[PDB]
Amino acid sequence: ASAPILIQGAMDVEVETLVAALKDKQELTVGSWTYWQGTLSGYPVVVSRTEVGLANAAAATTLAMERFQPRLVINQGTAGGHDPALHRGDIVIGTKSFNMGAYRSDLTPAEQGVDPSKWHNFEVTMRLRDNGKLVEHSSFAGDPELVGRALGMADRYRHGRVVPGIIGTADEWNRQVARINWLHQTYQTAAEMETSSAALVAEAYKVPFVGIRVLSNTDLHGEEFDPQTAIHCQQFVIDYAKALINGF
Amino acid sequence: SAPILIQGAMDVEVETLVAALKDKQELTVGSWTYWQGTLSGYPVVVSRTEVGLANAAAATTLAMERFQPRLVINQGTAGGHDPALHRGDIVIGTKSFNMGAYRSDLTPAEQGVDPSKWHNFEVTMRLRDNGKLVEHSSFAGDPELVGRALGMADRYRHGRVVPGIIGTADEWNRQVARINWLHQTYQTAAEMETSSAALVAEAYKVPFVGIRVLSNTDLHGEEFDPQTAIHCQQFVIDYAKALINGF
Ligand SMILES: CSC[C@H]1O[C@@H](n2cnc3c(N)ncnc32)[C@H](O)[C@@H]1O
Ligand SMILES: CSC[C@H]1O[C@@H](n2cnc3c(N)ncnc32)[C@H](O)[C@@H]1O
Numbered sequence A: 001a002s003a004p005i006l007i008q009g010a011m012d013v014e015v016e017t018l019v020a021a022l023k024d025k026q027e028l029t030v031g032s033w034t035y036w037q038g039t040l041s042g043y044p045v046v047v048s049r050t051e052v053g054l055a056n057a058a059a060a061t062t063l064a065m066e067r068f069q070p071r072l073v074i075n076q077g078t079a080g081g082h083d084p085a086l087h088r089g090d091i092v093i094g095t096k097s098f099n100m101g102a103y104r105s106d107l108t109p110a111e112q113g114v115d116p117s118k119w120h121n122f123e124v125t126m127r128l129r130d131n132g133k134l135v136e137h138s139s140f141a142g143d144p145e146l147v148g149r150a151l152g153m154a155d156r157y158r159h160g161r162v163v164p165g166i167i168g169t170a171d172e173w174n175r176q177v178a179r180i181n182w183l184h185q186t187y188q189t190a191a192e193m194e195t196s197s198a199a200l201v202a203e204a205y206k207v208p209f210v211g212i213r214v215l216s217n218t219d220l221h222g223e224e225f226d227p228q229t230a231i232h233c234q235q236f237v238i239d240y241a242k243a244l245i246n247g248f
Numbered sequence B: 001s002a003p004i005l006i007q008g009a010m011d012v013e014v015e016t017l018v019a020a021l022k023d024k025q026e027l028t029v030g031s032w033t034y035w036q037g038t039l040s041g042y043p044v045v046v047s048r049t050e051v052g053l054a055n056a057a058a059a060t061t062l063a064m065e066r067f068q069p070r071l072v073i074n075q076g077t078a079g080g081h082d083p084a085l086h087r088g089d090i091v092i093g094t095k096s097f098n099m100g101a102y103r104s105d106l107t108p109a110e111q112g113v114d115p116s117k118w119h120n121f122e123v124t125m126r127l128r129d130n131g132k133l134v135e136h137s138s139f140a141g142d143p144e145l146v147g148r149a150l151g152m153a154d155r156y157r158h159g160r161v162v163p164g165i166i167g168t169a170d171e172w173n174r175q176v177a178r179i180n181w182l183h184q185t186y187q188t189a190a191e192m193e194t195s196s197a198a199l200v201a202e203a204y205k206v207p208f209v210g211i212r213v214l215s216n217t218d219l220h221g222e223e224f225d226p227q228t229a230i231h232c233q234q235f236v237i238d239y240a241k242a243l244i245n246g247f
Helices: A016-021 A054-068 A144-152 A177-187 A195-204 A228-247 B015-020 B053-067 B143-151 B176-186 B194-204 B227-246
Strands: A005-009 A023-030 A033-040 A043-049 A072-080 A091-099 A128-130 A133-135 A162-169 A189-191 A209-217 B004-008 B022-029 B032-039 B042-048 B071-079 B090-098 B127-129 B132-134 B161-168 B188-190 B208-216
Touching: A005 A054, A005 A228, A016 A033, A016 A228, A023 A054, A033 A054, A033 A228, A043 A054, A054 A072, A054 A195, A054 B053, A054 B194, A072 A195, A072 A228, A091 A144, A091 A195, A128 A195, A144 A162, A144 A209, A144 A228, A162 A177, A162 A195, A177 A189, A195 A209, A195 B053, A209 A228, B004 B053, B004 B227, B015 B227, B022 B053, B032 B053, B032 B227, B042 B053, B053 B071, B053 B194, B071 B194, B071 B227, B090 B143, B090 B194, B127 B194, B143 B161, B143 B208, B143 B227, B161 B176, B161 B194, B176 B188, B194 B208, B208 B227
Parallel strands: A005 A043, A005 A072, A072 A209, A091 A162, A162 A189, B004 B042, B004 B071, B071 B208, B090 B161, B161 B188
Antiparallel strands: A023 A033, A033 A043, A091 A209, A128 A133, B022 B032, B032 B042, B090 B208, B127 B132
C-alpha cells in the first residue's frame, strides 16, 4: 500500500473543497480530529481538519502520523498579511515557519511597565530531540524541493501572486497595525495559527512538509476576510498534489 | 490495566519519576520518550514531553494512541503570578487555560501597540465532540483529582499546596508589570504545557490534573531552583501511589 499525502486545513471552509475532490472516501474521527481518506488521481490522500491553533495542529498532525504514516504533509489555509507588498488572494509558500508567539523577556521591575518590543522569540518552544539527543530549531524550513515545486507552479494559480515567504505561527490574530509592522520588521514575516506547530511534528517524524497559505485578509490594506480565498487556495493545492502524484 | 500517564517537559522534571518505576521499558517515537513500568505493581507511563504547547499536545496525543491511559497527571515547574505564593509552593490546577492566546481590535499604526487591549482568544481551546463544536474558555482539572491533591497537602514538606489557576503560554515573562497585569486580569497563580495537554485530555475524555511547583517567582526575587522539580516529583509519586492503592 502506498503512503498517503496528508493535506491539512483548520476550518471547514479550508477543507470542504479538498474533501469534495477525493474519490472513494471514508471519514474517521478520533478525539476532536476528523480525517477523510480517499484518492486523488488514484493515489491515497488523507485530508485533515485540524481545528485552530498550535495545540490542535500538533495533536492533529501527531494523530495523522500514528494512524496514516504519510509520505509528506501539506499544511494549508488562510492567513493575514504582514508584508505590505502582499494583498488578499496572494499565496505564500513557506520557505520557513516559526513560532512567532513564543516570547521570553529579561527581568524588569513593575515601575518600568510592559514593553512588548523587549519580548524576544523563545526558541526552546521549537527544540526537539532526535534519537534522544537535543536539537535546536529557530524555525522549520519548508522542504526545499516541495517549496520550489509550488513556486514553479505559480503561473497555474489564477487569483493572485504565489511568493516565497516566512510564515509566522502564533495563537494570535493581530489587528494592531503597529504590532503587525513590528513583527514584519523583526522576523521578516509574509503572513501570520497552525503552520509551525504542524511543521514541528513533521520534523520530529522526519516527514517532508510544506506550508501553503493564502492571504484572506490584511489590515495593511484595509482588506477584510474573504472566505472565497480559502476555496482558491484548496484548488491550487489540489493541482499541486496531483503534480506530485504524477511523479510518484 | 490502563496506565496512569505522568508527564514532565524537561529531564530534571522526569528522572525522579523514571527512577521510581519497576520493570521499565523505554520507547521513543519522533521527539518523544516514554518509560513504561509499574508503581506499586500498577502500570504507569512516564512521558518527557519537551517544552511548550505544540510539544505538549504532540506528546499527549502520542501517549493516548500508544497507551490509552486512564488518567493524566501533568507536572513540572512554573513561575509565580500570585504574590501570596513563593518558590517551593505547589499549585494544583483548578483550571488551566491558554493565557498566550490573543486577539486584538483594529488600530491604525499611529496608535502604537497596547497589550492591555488584547483579548483572550478562546478559539484556540475550541474542540469538536462527535464532530460538533464545543467551546472552552479553560479546562477544569478533574475536581476529584484536584481535591485528592489538596487533601494530601500535609505530605509535602517543602512549601504549601494550594488550588490555583494555571496560565499556559509559550512564554517566560519577567516583566513584573506584565505578570501583575496577567494576575489581575486572569487570576493566575502561576505561568508552557498544562492547558495544551489538558486540551488533548479533554478531546479524548481522559481525567486530567495539573500539578506545578513554583521553581521561581519574580514577585519575590526568587530565581530558579532545580531542586523544586525533584520535590514536585516526590509529591506526585506519593499522589500516584495513593490513586493506585484505591484501584
Ligand atoms: C478562526 S481563527 C483564524 C483561522 O484562520 C487563520 N487565520 C487567517 N487569518 C489570520 C490572521 N490574520 N491572523 C491569525 N490567523 C489567521 C488561522 O490560522 C486560523 O486557523
Ligand atoms: C526551559 S522553558 C521553561 C520550562 O519550565 C516551565 N517553566 C518554569 N518556570 C516558568 C516560568 N516562569 N514561565 C514559563 N514557564 C516556566 C515551563 O513550563 C517549561 O517547560
